[PDB]
Scaffold this active site. Structure first.
Site: not given
Ligand SMILES: [Cl-]
Ligand SMILES: [Cl-]
Length: 162
Positions: A11, A20, A32, A104, A117, A132
């Site tokens: 990040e 972002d 965020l 996250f 998945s 996948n």
């Protein structure tokens, strides 16, 4: 290597409000603020999160506080999610970190929808889950980061982060 370092790599750290990859107002370590196009809306959200008039800027310490909160919330989200919990419980420690990183990044709800998945992950079908996972908007939009998380699931090591 651990979840904190991992996400800190993915990040980055920014002390001033920023947009972002989706153009959303964010700050710190991937925190965020708002999906609204209003910088004021974000500044407000920011002040309310920090508890002071920030004026769009925060300290390293404040950024870290938000980060801890955010990591904690992702874990708790997983543990309380009926679709997520069982997958998490079945995995080893490295792979649990990869699932936390996905939550996250994209939210509990987003992850919970990778039904196929998730099932492959639970079944320990590594290569298949890896293939996948790559068929997703997630991968197409932030491929380098996604590859790192995917390699983590595939191999069960931190090699991608070293
Ligand atoms: Cl908050
Ligand atoms: Cl990327």
């Amino acid at each position: 290597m651990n979840i904190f370092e991992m996400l800190r790599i993915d990040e980055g750290l920014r002390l001033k409000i920023y947009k972002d990859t989706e153009g959303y107002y964010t700050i710190g370590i991937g925190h965020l603020l708002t999906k609204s196009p209003s910088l004021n809306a974000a500044k407000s959200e920011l002040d309310k999160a920090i508890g002071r008039n920030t004026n769009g800027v925060i300290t390293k310490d404040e950024a870290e506080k938000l980060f801890n909160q955010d990591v904690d919330a992702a874990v708790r989200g997983i543990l309380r999610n009926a679709k997520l919990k069982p997958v998490y419980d079945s995995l080893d420690a490295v792979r649990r970190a990869a699932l936390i990183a996905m939550v996250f990044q994209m939210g509990e709800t987003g992850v919970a929808g990778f039904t196929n998945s998730l099932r492959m992950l639970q079944q320990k079908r590594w290569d298949e889950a890896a293939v996948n996972l790559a068929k997703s908007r997630w991968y197409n939009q932030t491929p380098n980061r996604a590859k790192r998380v995917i390699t983590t699931f595939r191999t069960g090591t931190w090699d991608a982060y070293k």
